[PDB]
Symmetry: C2
Subunit: 50 residues, 2 copies
């Protein structure tokens, strides 16, 4: 097309969110509960020590 700004809106509509950033968000969300549990177990060990 020759329409100014058509490429921007068409890319935006085609890709509401990039796949790579979506996957980064997914892996972060998957990892968060594991880190929470690990730190909770660390605090449990701190309780055990005292």
């Amino acid at each position: 097309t020759q329409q100014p700004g058509c490429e921007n809106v068409c890319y935006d509509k085609s890709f509401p969110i990039s796949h790579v950033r979506f996957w980064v968000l997914q892996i972060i969300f998957v990892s968060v509960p594991t880190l929470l549990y690990l730190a909770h177990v660390f605090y449990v060990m701190r309780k055990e020590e005292k």
Copy 2:
């Protein structure tokens, strides 16, 4: 502007009819009655001859 076709419509709106063509139409319209009268007088002379 960068909009395709904007120049065409803007020129069309700015100049509904060119001044030169408008003046040509005006002079033709002014001349027509004179030519009609001249040819009518020519026919009147043809009547006079016969």
